[PDB]
Design an enzyme around this catalytic site. Structure first.
Site, PDB file in Angstrom:
ATOM      1  N   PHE A   2     -22.654  -2.927  26.324  1.00 10.91           N
ATOM      2  CA  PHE A   2     -22.507  -4.228  27.725  1.00 10.91           C
ATOM      3  C   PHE A   2     -21.149  -3.312  28.550  1.00 10.91           C
ATOM      4  O   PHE A   2     -21.468  -4.849  29.572  1.00 10.91           O
ATOM      5  CB  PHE A   2     -22.962  -5.427  27.609  1.00 10.91           C
ATOM      6  CG  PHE A   2     -22.751  -6.005  26.661  1.00 10.91           C
ATOM      7  CD1 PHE A   2     -20.952  -6.636  27.192  1.00 10.91           C
ATOM      8  CD2 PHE A   2     -22.632  -6.528  25.164  1.00 10.91           C
ATOM      9  CE1 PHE A   2     -20.204  -7.756  26.453  1.00 10.91           C
ATOM     10  CE2 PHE A   2     -21.522  -7.045  24.448  1.00 10.91           C
ATOM     11  CZ  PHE A   2     -20.932  -7.558  25.276  1.00 10.91           C
ATOM     12  N   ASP A   3     -20.247  -3.558  27.784  1.00  6.75           N
ATOM     13  CA  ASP A   3     -19.009  -3.920  27.810  1.00  6.75           C
ATOM     14  C   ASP A   3     -18.220  -2.423  27.480  1.00  6.75           C
ATOM     15  O   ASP A   3     -18.454  -2.494  26.468  1.00  6.75           O
ATOM     16  CB  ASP A   3     -18.126  -4.952  28.224  1.00  6.75           C
ATOM     17  CG  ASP A   3     -17.062  -5.202  28.779  1.00  6.75           C
ATOM     18  OD1 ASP A   3     -16.916  -4.279  29.545  1.00  6.75           O
ATOM     19  OD2 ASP A   3     -16.377  -6.169  29.210  1.00  6.75           O
TER      20      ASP A   3
ATOM     21  N   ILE B 241     -13.779 -15.801  24.050  1.00  3.31           N
ATOM     22  CA  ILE B 241     -14.477 -16.393  23.060  1.00  3.31           C
ATOM     23  C   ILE B 241     -13.635 -16.692  21.777  1.00  3.31           C
ATOM     24  O   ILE B 241     -12.832 -15.843  21.695  1.00  3.31           O
ATOM     25  CB  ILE B 241     -15.858 -15.393  22.958  1.00  3.31           C
ATOM     26  CG1 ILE B 241     -15.999 -13.687  22.732  1.00  3.31           C
ATOM     27  CG2 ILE B 241     -16.768 -15.994  24.972  1.00  3.31           C
ATOM     28  CD1 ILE B 241     -16.835 -13.576  22.609  1.00  3.31           C
TER      29      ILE B 241
ATOM     30  N   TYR C 250     -21.376 -16.677  23.679  1.00  6.50           N
ATOM     31  CA  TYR C 250     -21.275 -17.091  25.072  1.00  6.50           C
ATOM     32  C   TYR C 250     -22.579 -18.666  24.688  1.00  6.50           C
ATOM     33  O   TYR C 250     -22.973 -19.113  25.917  1.00  6.50           O
ATOM     34  CB  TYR C 250     -22.135 -16.608  25.768  1.00  6.50           C
ATOM     35  CG  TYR C 250     -21.288 -15.899  26.909  1.00  6.50           C
ATOM     36  CD1 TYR C 250     -19.560 -15.728  27.940  1.00  6.50           C
ATOM     37  CD2 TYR C 250     -20.925 -14.037  25.639  1.00  6.50           C
ATOM     38  CE1 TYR C 250     -18.776 -15.199  28.181  1.00  6.50           C
ATOM     39  CE2 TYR C 250     -19.385 -12.965  26.616  1.00  6.50           C
ATOM     40  CZ  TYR C 250     -19.042 -13.263  27.531  1.00  6.50           C
ATOM     41  OH  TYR C 250     -18.101 -13.074  27.979  1.00  6.50           O
TER      42      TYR C 250
ATOM     43  N   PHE D 279     -18.003  -5.935  18.540  1.00  4.05           N
ATOM     44  CA  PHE D 279     -17.030  -5.561  19.519  1.00  4.05           C
ATOM     45  C   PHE D 279     -16.832  -4.104  18.124  1.00  4.05           C
ATOM     46  O   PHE D 279     -16.769  -4.652  17.022  1.00  4.05           O
ATOM     47  CB  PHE D 279     -16.097  -6.091  19.599  1.00  4.05           C
ATOM     48  CG  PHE D 279     -16.961  -7.300  20.890  1.00  4.05           C
ATOM     49  CD1 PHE D 279     -16.640  -6.825  22.358  1.00  4.05           C
ATOM     50  CD2 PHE D 279     -17.424  -8.451  20.015  1.00  4.05           C
ATOM     51  CE1 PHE D 279     -17.549  -7.104  23.121  1.00  4.05           C
ATOM     52  CE2 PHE D 279     -17.679  -9.474  21.469  1.00  4.05           C
ATOM     53  CZ  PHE D 279     -18.116  -8.966  22.810  1.00  4.05           C
TER      54      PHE D 279
END
Lengths: 107, 144, 903
Positions: free
Chosen positions: A36-37, A56, A82, A99
């Site tokens: 997603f990123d 975060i 989130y 990540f």
């Protein structure tokens, strides 16, 4: 939460301190493997200051654990991510994030 | 060979005598090549030699060839076609205008010994007229 | 999960040495192998995506990762299917799943890392060591139905070196006891080198070469299979010749000994230059005499077993034979003059030469079988104490020198027989066709992209035949099918140059066969609706003498350049982008007015090829043999999808294995749980168990049906299928010493055989009752169970979280009514629609929405060839350094991902 699993070793001596600017290259995936990123797509390292709450909680703790020049995998639970609200349109509610973070330098 | 073929196409006795010879002597034109007009040796030999004349003619001369074929359909003589081309030296194909002509001319100029050609309008007219006459008569023979 | 996804991904390629090892009953191959890979350079991020680098083993038949798209998000390498098992420094890779594995100082493969891979086929197991430290994880219990080879998969930005031992790379660590260096597995008629795997394209001098399928060895090719010669009884008339042939062979042996320099001595030793057996045949020791005699008898018995008949022709011929003269120099310390019997008066029919070849084959195979029984194995390096031999391989794989030696040795015996006059009648040879794969699937078809189809004009292109085998070339229609031989239908007009033929809706003689390096010029004239073929600039003619190969062609949608290459064939397609590159355009076509196909293209023409990876596709609405009916759910039955065989019990009926799945999967949860007949509302609303069933109709043999689930990566179009063919592998993670911490089974096919639910008494006769097999899956625990006619079955399966499973049925039809997917439910168990569709997650009413349909496995599909390919440089670095593989220039593609199919 956050679990850190090394991918490639750093120097093992220098770690980010509060108020220091960390420069990183990261790729973000959902727990099921959907990307997603990624800062590498934008070709620009991402910079953030520790202790300013710009990122975060999982990131804030995992990057602090990491060391300069190190590549690691951060598994962040929903609460450190989130959370229930999520990121509408990007991250579903109650989503664990994975990540792949490389800490390029400290400044 | 093209002149002999032109004589054959123009003369009605020529075709009939050729036909009679073939039928009477049971000549196997198919065996010779490896009866029907497409198997006539005159036409077969002219078709086999035609690429030589077409290679003699340059790509820029295709429109002149079409004009000469039109005149031959108009039934003007060889010298009259020669005069017509000599006067219409222009109307030659434009390499810049057309895009197949560009690579056709590249290929034409690639071969050695073809650089000192097309410098003589008389030579251009001669080759255009000869190839156009052969082509026109071949077309008439192919489809009446 | 709904919209198609896109992302930029790296191209990945695999490299292997030509080393193939396997296991089979009676095989000549050793069982334990070892190799190493040293990493010199890795760029972790040459592009935005992390560099790929994996080392491991792969199975010869099944591992074929093509460049570009594939399973998951592409970039398929070692361990991205169930045919390969790879290690990347941190994970064990198999079936496209990464499993973390512990090692001291674990890290992603980095420069100066040495990976040692050990394969033990006896268990079977695959183990790794990183810099000499054990990797606490193993693959085991995997399929053994092929040959294994070392392999490394990588993206651009790597430099590695294969170390195979011996002169082909010095190991940095000692192989574990009993494991053999991989350089010893190189076959006698091959030279060690690094090669790509299943390439359809390679770089050539004039331009890229198109490559047909490679012919691969099978693990069964190493099992010697001689013809038994013990049951044969030796006729007495042949017994008479047995001793005489033994004596003649001994004389030939003696003359060869004097040529080599062998001489006589009480004991045998090469350096001492002496021989005990050099004495005359009668003088030869009785054991050796009987040994030569029994080899003689074996020669005659092999002759009989092969089946040719031996008959005495002429006794005068026997009496006319004489022994040749040899001088005193050939006379040697024994004292007996060698007297080889002359045979110049006798010659050999070519049939009998084939017979001698077959006899040598049988003799060598018998010897190899005996050696294997004794415990010997093959090795490129001879080791007598270890029972390793360079010749201990089947005759077909033996090298030419040894084959010629044995063939001459036996041709001498056949000369002796024929000279003595016995007529030997070679038996009639009956050809047998292996037909391993269908012909259309076997031949690889390359064609121009559909958008290039031409509907007018005069077009020309060239095809050079690097080989001379089976290749076709010509013009195809845009709707050409990938699983049909070129020109077998009306969709292609092609020329076959192996044996001059023209193919369109069948074959006809045309032209002449080509030689290596011959160029076929293909021309299409759409003004005259004709197709012409030229060979080296000369027009090919039919038998009738016509210049045009085909006439009266309808333009239709247009025409595309096409070629097809059989196994082992190589061609070069020149579409004419560089007109000067064409070799025979000027001689034929240019003056005729034809134009090169790609003359005015600024980019090379894109091509597609017929990929032989089976894929699931919806059953066509006009399939000649198979029909699917969507049955609405009545009060007493649920929604159903019924399959029927349209042409059953008639001529031209197609009866073959059929692999069916449902178009949508069920996905297991991310996290598994820790540790009359109405449904109860709370139970049904809180349940995570889902059900579906399959009805095998009466008259359809249950023994020919398999029911269950498949994962997204099932691709086996096995025409003889059974549960033993299913891919499976166990990944076992343990501690530093034993203490197995986790044993996970991995597969792509979870089914029950229909023959498990037929009573032994009911077996042997057709039943008049349908068989209902129900499948239950608990999406919250990963457990899969089965029922037969309402009775719980013993079979059960366990899968990992996030697993995707498609309902599936494999059936060999035996009736017009075959099977029925029933999307029903059970008491307190939800139907499949509730699992498949989010909006129906809480709906207990069975449904069959239009998206849910039946898909069948198609063997071949069209696939676009990339315009650019990774540049991989392979070279022998040195005697000690090994074989270096290097890839430096990045290459990326934009991938489109179908979420539900995970490809």
């Amino acid at each position: 939460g956050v679990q850190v699993e090394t991918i490639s070793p750093g120097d093992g001596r220098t770690f980010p301190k509060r108020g220091q600017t960390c420069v990183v290259h990261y790729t973000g995936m959902l727990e099921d493997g959907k990307k997603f990123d990624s800062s590498r797509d934008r070709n620009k390292p991402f910079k953030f200051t520790l202790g300013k709450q710009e990122v975060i909680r999982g990131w804030e703790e995992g990057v602090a654990q990491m060391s300069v020049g190190q590549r690691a995998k951060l598994i962040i639970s929903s609460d450190y991510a989130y959370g229930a609200t999520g990121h509408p349109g990007i991250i579903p509610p109650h989503a664990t994030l994975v990540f792949d973070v490389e800490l390029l330098k400290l400044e | 060979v093209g002149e002999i073929f032109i004589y054959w196409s123009k003369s009605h006795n020529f075709k009939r005598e050729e036909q009679n010879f073939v039928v009477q002597n049971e000549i196997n034109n198919m065996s010779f090549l490896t009866y029907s007009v497409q198997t006539s040796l005159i036409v077969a030999t002219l078709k086999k030699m035609l690429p030589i004349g077409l290679n003699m003619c340059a790509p820029t001369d295709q429109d002149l060839i079409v004009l000469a074929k039109a005149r031959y359909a108009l039934k003007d003589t060889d010298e009259e076609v020669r005069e017509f081309l000599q006067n219409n030296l222009n109307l030659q194909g434009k390499v810049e205008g057309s895009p197949s002509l560009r690579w056709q001319m590249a290929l034409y100029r690639g071969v050695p010994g073809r650089e000192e050609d097309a410098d003589d309008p008389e030579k251009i007219v001669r080759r255009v007229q000869e190839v156009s006459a052969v082509l026109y008569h071949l077309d008439q023979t192919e489809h009446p | 999960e709904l919209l198609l996804q896109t992302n930029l991904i790296n191209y990945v390629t695999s490299i292997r040495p030509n080393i193939f090892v396997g296991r089979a009953e009676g095989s000549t191959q050793y069982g334990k192998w070892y190799f190493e890979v040293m990493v010199d350079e890795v760029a972790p991020f040459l592009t935005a995506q992390a560099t790929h680098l994996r080392v491991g083993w792969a199975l010869s038949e099944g591992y074929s990762p093509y460049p570009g798209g594939g399973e998951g998000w592409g970039g398929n390498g070692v361990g991205d299917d169930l045919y390969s098992y790879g290690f990347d420094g941190l994970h064990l890779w198999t079936g496209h799943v990464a499993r973390p594995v512990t090692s001291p100082g674990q890290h992603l493969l980095a420069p100066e890392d040495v990976v040692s891979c050990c394969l033990d086929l006896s268990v079977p197991s695959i183990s790794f060591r990183i810099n000499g430290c054990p990797v606490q994880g193993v693959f085991e219990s995997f399929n053994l139905d092929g040959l294994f080879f070392p392999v490394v998969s990588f993206s651009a930005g790597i430099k590695v070196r294969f170390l195979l031992g011996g002169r082909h790379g010095e190991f940095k660590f000692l192989p574990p006891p009993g494991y053999a260096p991989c350089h010893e597995a190189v076959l006698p008629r091959e030279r060690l080198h690094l090669q790509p795997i299943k390439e359809y394209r390679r770089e050539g001098p004039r331009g890229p070469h198109l490559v047909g399928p490679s012919r691969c060895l099978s693990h069964l090719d190493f099992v010697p299979c001689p013809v038994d010669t013990i049951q044969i009884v030796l006729p007495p008339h042949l017994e008479r010749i047995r001793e005489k042939l033994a004596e003649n062979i001994h004389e030939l042996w003696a003359l060869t000994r004097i040529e080599q320099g062998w001489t006589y001595g009480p004991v045998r030793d090469d350096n001492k230059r002496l021989h005990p057996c050099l004495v005359n045949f009668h003088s030869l020791p009785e054991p050796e005499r009987n040994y030569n005699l029994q080899m003689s008898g074996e020669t005659l018995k092999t002759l009989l077993a092969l089946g040719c008949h031996v008959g005495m022709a002429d006794e005068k011929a026997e009496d006319n034979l004489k022994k040749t003269k040899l001088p005193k120099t050939y006379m040697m310390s024994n004292g007996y003059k060698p007297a080889p019997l002359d045979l110049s008066h006798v010659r050999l029919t070519p049939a009998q030469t084939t017979l001698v070849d077959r006899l040598a084959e049988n003799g060598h195979n018998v010897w190899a079988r005996d050696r294997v029984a004794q415990g010997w194995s093959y090795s490129a390096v001879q080791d007598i104490p270890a029972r390793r031999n360079p010749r201990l391989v089947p005759y077909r794989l033996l090298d030419e020198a040894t084959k010629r030696s044995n063939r001459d040795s036996l041709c001498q015996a056949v000369r002796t027989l024929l000279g003595y006059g016995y007529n030997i009648e070679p038996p009639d040879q009956e050809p047998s066709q292996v037909d391993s794969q269908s012909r259309g699937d076997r031949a690889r078809i390359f064609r121009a992209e559909k958008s290039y189809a031409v509907q007018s004009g005069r077009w020309y292109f060239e095809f050079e035949a690097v080989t001379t085998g089976e290749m076709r070339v010509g013009w195809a229609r845009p709707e050409l099918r990938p699983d049909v031989e070129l020109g077998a239908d009306d969709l292609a007009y092609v020329f076959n140059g192996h044996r001059g033929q023209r193919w369109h809706l069948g074959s006809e003689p045309f032209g002449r066969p080509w030689q290596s390096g011959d160029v076929v010029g293909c021309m299409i004239d759409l003004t005259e609706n004709t197709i012409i073929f030229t060979l080296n600039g000369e027009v090919l003619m039919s038998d009738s003498g016509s210049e045009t190969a085909f006439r009266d062609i309808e333009i239709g949608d247009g025409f595309l350049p096409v070629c097809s290459l059989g196994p082992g064939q190589v061609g070069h397609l020149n579409l004419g982008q560089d007109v000067s590159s064409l070799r025979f355009f000027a001689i034929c076509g240019l003056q005729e007015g034809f134009e090169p196909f790609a003359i005015n293209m600024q980019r090379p023409v894109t091509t597609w090829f017929s990929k032989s990876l089976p894929q699931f596709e919806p059953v066509p609405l006009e399939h000649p043999h198979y029909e699917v009916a969507r049955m609405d759910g009545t009060v007493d039955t649920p929604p159903c999808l019924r399959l029927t065989h349209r042409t059953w019990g008639s001529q031209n009926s197609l009866v073959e294995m059929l692999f069916l799945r449902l178009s949508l999967p069920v996905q297991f949860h991310q996290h598994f749980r820790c540790t009359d007949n109405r449904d109860d509302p709370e139970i049904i609303l809180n349940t995570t168990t889902y059900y579906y069933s399959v009805r095998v109709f009466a008259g359809q043999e249950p023994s020919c049906v398999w029911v269950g689930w498949v994962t997204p990566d099932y691709h086996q179009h096995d025409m003889s299928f059974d549960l033993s063919k299913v891919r499976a592998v166990t990944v076992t993670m343990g501690d530093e010493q034993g203490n197995v911490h986790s044993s996970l089974k991995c597969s792509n096919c979870y089914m029950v055989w229909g023959g498990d639910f037929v009573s032994p008494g009911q077996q042997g006769r057709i039943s008049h009752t349908d068989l209902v097999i129900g499948c239950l899956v608990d999406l919250a625990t990963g457990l899969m169970t089965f029922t037969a006619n309402g009775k719980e079955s013993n079979t059960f399966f366990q899968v990992e979280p996030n697993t995707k499973l498609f309902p599936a049925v494999f059936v060999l039809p035996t009736h017009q009514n075959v099977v029925q997917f029933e999307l029903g439910k059970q008491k307190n168990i939800m139907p499949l629609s509730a699992a498949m569709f989010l909006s129906e997650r809480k709906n207990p009413a069975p449904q069959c929405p239009p998206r849910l349909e039946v898909q069948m496995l198609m063997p071949v599909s069209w696939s676009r060839m990339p315009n650019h390919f990774l540049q991989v440089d392979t070279r022998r670095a040195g005697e000690r350094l090994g074989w270096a593989v290097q890839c430096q220039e990045p290459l990326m593609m934009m991938a489109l991902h179908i979420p539900e199919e995970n490809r």
